[PDB]
Each structure stands twice: as C-alpha cells, then as structure tokens.
Structure 1
Amino acid sequence: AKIGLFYGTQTGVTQTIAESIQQEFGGESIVDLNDIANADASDLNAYDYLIIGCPTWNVGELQSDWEGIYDDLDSVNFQGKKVAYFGAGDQVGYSDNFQDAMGILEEKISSLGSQTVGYWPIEGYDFNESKAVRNNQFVGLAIDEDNQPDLTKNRIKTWVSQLKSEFGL
C-alpha cells in the first residue's frame, strides 16, 4: 500500500484504533497495518507516507515496543516523507503527561527530516501538560478510550478526512 501504519500496543486499544483508521482510509489496498513489535526500523523506508501510533505508558513513556526500536530510527532517512501520528492516553489519570509518547516520537522523527501532517485541536480535551502539544495544537490525533470513548469514532472519521487531502488521496 502507499501508506504504512506502524503501531505499538500494550492492552490492545491502539491496535483497535489502527484498525479503524485503516478501515476509514479504505482497507488493505490503501493502508498497510504493521505492528512495530515485529518490525525492523528499515521497514519504514518503504513508504512515502507513514502513520505512527503509540499509547503513552507508565510515567509519560513510550509503549515498550516503540521503546525498543527508538534508537534504530536514526538509521532511517525520513527526508521527504510525510508522517501523521495518533496515540491513546488518559487525560484524567495522567493529566501532566497526556499523550507524551506521541510527542516524543514526533520530536524524534521530525528531527530526522520528515514533515508532520495531521495537527489536531486541543480544545476537546482537559489536561495540564503534554509533550505532544505545539503552539496550542496536538501534533496528531489524541484518542482517550478511558474517558471519552463516545468521541473516538467521530474523531477518527474527521482526522482521516483531513489526512486524505494531505496524503494526496
């Protein structure tokens, strides 16, 4: 497929989100679903468009699978690639580290030369701090299944519509 979606998940929430995003784009012919646990950093070179999904764990940390491959990301040339991000988090229980993982990954990947696409508004959330916020916007789609499960479907539909334009679809 033209778009490669790489996700990491601990309790399965991020995977379900990834599956809905794939479905919203039109299926396997449009988006390849890849678990980062089974991937090598170089697998990311094969796509011009990437979607990175990662839930925040422990104290504002990367999901373990993303944690593992983090240092290897330096070996991938991201120049010219357009990358979107999404993450699962808990704004109530971790109000000081909401969606930190997504922020940590975007900081690293954008520093390697990629173009971030898919900024999302912060107004629909209530949190104190997040490493995923830049100039009053999230760097990617923030999902909260713990506190706002009723908003997920529409958030995904809206975000995917937004990305289609930016990914040339």
Structure 2
Amino acid sequence: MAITGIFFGSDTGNTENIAKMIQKQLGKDVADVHDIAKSSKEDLEAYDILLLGIPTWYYGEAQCDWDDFFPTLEEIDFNGKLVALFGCGDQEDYAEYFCDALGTIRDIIEPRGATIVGHWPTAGYHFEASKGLADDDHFVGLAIDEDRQPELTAERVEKWVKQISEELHLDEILNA
C-alpha cells in the first residue's frame, strides 16, 4: 500500500486538483488521495506520512466534513507520523482569516505527537492576520494566493512538494 495519505477538504473542488498534483509527483506507489468523509480514526493511522489539505470559508470557517471529523482527529495517534498541511484562500475582505483553518489542524496534531514539515514562505504577508503563520516569514503549510484567488498554482505546489520530499526523504523514492 501507499505510505502517504493525502486527505483534502473541498467546496468548489479546487483542492482535488492540488491533491492530484501532489500524488502525481510522489507516485501512486508512494501516495494515495482521500476525503475525510470516508475516514475513521485508523484510516489516518495506516499511513506514516499525512498530507492534510484544508480550504477556509466564511470568515475563518472550516468545511463541514473536516469540522465533523475534528472530535475524531483529537483521538488519532500521530506519534511519529510526519504531517504536512496545504490550503488555498481569499483575504480581500477576509483580511484576518487567510487559510485560517490550517491552524485548526496544526493545534491538534502536535500534542498527539505529529512531526510537522512543509513550511511555505509568506514573502511579506500583506494583510491584517493569518492563523496559518508559524512565523511572520512563513506559513506552517502551503497557502496559495495570487491577487485574492489561487492562481499560478502548479509552480508553487511543485516547489512545495519538492521541499517536503527532501524533509520526508520521498525524493530518493520518487526520483529512483
């Protein structure tokens, strides 16, 4: 079976394309793609590496499928699991809520013993606040935006996948 579980929350379906652009680089032998709706606690524990994609909506809201799973997420064993986060957003009016829901996963996985990878630079975050920040210089996960919407996506998710592949040591699996 695959060693990486990619799980993506969605509404407009944009995150499915991100999950596929991740999986195609890693290879199907290395990564598989899921939506938390079909998951149980053991469905994550089966994997060593977990890529948890989450969009943010309606002023820092998490999508209902992930929100309903959070009381199960806090029971999952993450001890020694490698975890990376990804997301997309709009912040023109949502200026304090850009990719807010990244913080919601990041808060739960660490005390359950996760090892975090896959930071992404802000390149000088411009707006009021964002809860996905690990530092003012970098988000804790991939957070794509280009003029209030996700575009110029493929080059950014290629760079992010290549970065996690050298933290996770998937690079020496996928380039073989």
TM over 0.5: yes
- What code does the residue aligned with 1:61 have? E
Question: Using the alignment, how far apart are the partners of 2:19 and 2:125 within structure 1?
Answer: 21
SS in 1 for 2:129: coil
Uncovered stretches (5+) of structure 1, i.e. residues with no partner: none
- Give yes or no for contact 2:55–2:62 (8 Å, CA) kept in 1: yes
Length, aligned pairs only: 168
Uncovered stretches (5+) of structure 2, i.e. residues with no partner: 171-176
Residue of structure 2 equivalent to 1:10: 11
Residue of structure 1 equivalent to 2:174: none
- What code does the residue aligned with 1:76 have? I
Q: Percent identity?
A: 46
- Looking at secondary structure, tell me which structure has more helix per residue: 1
Q: CA RMSD in A?
A: 1.6
Task: Provide TM-score, normalisation by structure 1.
Answer: 0.92
Residue of structure 1 equivalent to 2:47: 47
Distance 1:144 1:78, change over 3 A: same
Question: Using the alignment, how far apart are the partners of 2:76 and 2:90 within structure 1?
Answer: 31
Deviation at 1:2, TM superposition (A): 0.9
- Give yes or no for contact 1:88–1:145 (8 Å, CA) kept in 2: no
1:132-169 CA-to-partner distances (Å, cap 9, x unmatched) read 10222100000237735442111101001101111112
SS in 2 for 1:107: helix
Question: Using the alignment, how far apart are the partners of 2:51 and 2:25 within structure 1?
Answer: 13
Deviation at 1:74, TM superposition (A): 2.1
Residue of structure 2 equivalent to 1:76: 76
1:95-127 CA-to-partner distances (Å, cap 9, x unmatched) read 110000111111111121111101111116532
Residue of structure 2 equivalent to 1:165: 166
